[model samples]
Target: GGGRTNVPNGYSQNDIQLMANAVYGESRGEPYLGQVAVAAVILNRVTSASFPNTVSGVIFEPRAFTAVADGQIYLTPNETAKKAVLDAINGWDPTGNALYYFNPDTATSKWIWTRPQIKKIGKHIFCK
Candidate 1:
């Protein structure tokens, strides 16, 4: 419904840049950029009428993000991890304009079968 902020308003540009660097650094070491990209897709979904509007709401929605369920995102993060979060906030989706993504190796949900594959990146395939 309103703009989301990882940092507070009135923050200095230096502060924002530092945060960006931290985020990018995190992405550099992650197992897959697709996971980073998928996060972008989820945030993008929040801005669309077709999905949830709030960032936390979108991330916490039941059965939505695997990272949330598996607790992969709950641990302390490195720069690479922060980068993925930053990329998501910055709208860098390897999935193009896709709204959905899943790991082919681990996903067995019936819904994933019906959705057409748009592209594969790292360990996941994406769909809109």
Candidate 2:
């Protein structure tokens, strides 16, 4: 693959782009900090033992993300989201190494409440 964008060692380009897709889908209109945090959470999940180790696996994991469920993940990511993905891939994390995040106003799943909370950026709450 070409080196148009920096790819983390051992991660496919698809992994990063799909992560961008997820970021745009879920947090397009969100604060820039929140968008970056969302990407960081995806990285945290992908790196954690609790979820799939691949970015695709974690992003497409059954019910793991709302954007995939609603078919919004297909939307082409803007530069902001893409850059945010790269930023997370580069080492910036606003979620405090969180592996999960949910909107306090929109999330209805009580199960996610079991995950410990860490940070709140914009509308979503990042969890561990």
Candidate 3:
């Protein structure tokens, strides 16, 4: 549809913006693939039964996304970051079926380490 943003049924522009902000805040320094993977995880959360059904719900739900926790989510996202969110919404999931991801060296939670590792791209590890 001419590369315009499309929401799935009940999704919103706020959902796209928030999800893009998350990608920018969380993975702006990582590779483009990493950013796409981060977006994938959020989209995955939207569909997963364990997480909230909407983008804002999944992203803002108490400690779900790191950017929301650190306040980086308020930062302005670049065009690439915005495009990455659209790409994810359009169905480019490099993270496969991952539901979680973190940098092992910096990740402090022992519980996060216990999830089954799926793949590593740039500095982050994806898990399911």
Candidate 4:
């Protein structure tokens, strides 16, 4: 799939696919913007020095994502998820620079709970 030259050296088509899978798998139950928020988290993690510097590394880094841990990241992604991924890639960050997020009722990580909450989006609470 090549007709243009705008793709960045940091990521490829496969990276986009993997991100879309994580977006869909992590929050398919959330709102439309919620899915975009999940993708936004990955991008922010890549930007933060505390986390991995690449999408592949960030998503697969130990316990970084519930979808990856639960094997849901391999599920086929929907069009909404793909579109949401594109929205985040284009710089629409719904997480507001937050580096972490989790479902409050379902999340059990004590370390994660210590993070200051930024905002809530559907089933997930984005945190700094």
Top lDDT hit = 4
lDDT of 2 by residue, 23-92 (tens): 8877888999998998888888877778877788788888776778888766566889899999888899
**Selected candidate, larger lDDT, 2 vs 3:** 3
Question: What ranges in model 1 sit over 4 Å off?
Answer: 1-32, 71-75
If candidate 2 were superposed on the true structure by all CA atoms, what would the RMSD be?
Answer: 5.1
lDDT of each: 0.58, 0.81, 0.83, 0.84
Query: 2 or 3: which has the higher TM-score?
Result: 3
* Candidate 3: worst-modelled 10 consecutive residues by lDDT: 2-11
Query: Which regions of candidate 4 are displaced past 4 Å?
Result: 1-10, 73-76
lDDT of 1 by residue, 13-97 (tens): 3433333333333234435676576556755666667876665556667877555555555345554555565666665767677
lDDT by residue for model 3 over 47-112, one digit each (tens)? 888887767778888877778878877656677888888888889999878998888889998888
lDDT of 4 by residue, 1-128 (tens): 67433323566778888899888778887799899999999888887878877788888998777678888766566889889989998999988898899889988999889988989999889998
| Model 2: lDDT of residue 70 | 80
| Better-scoring candidate (lDDT), 2 or 4 | 4
* Number of the top TM-score candidate: 3
Give the per-residue Cα lDDT of candidate 3 at 79.
78
Q: How many steric overlaps are in each model, in order? A: 9, 0, 0, 0
Candidate 2 colliding pairs: none
User: For model 1, what is the alpha-carbon lDDT of residue 127?
Assistant: 79
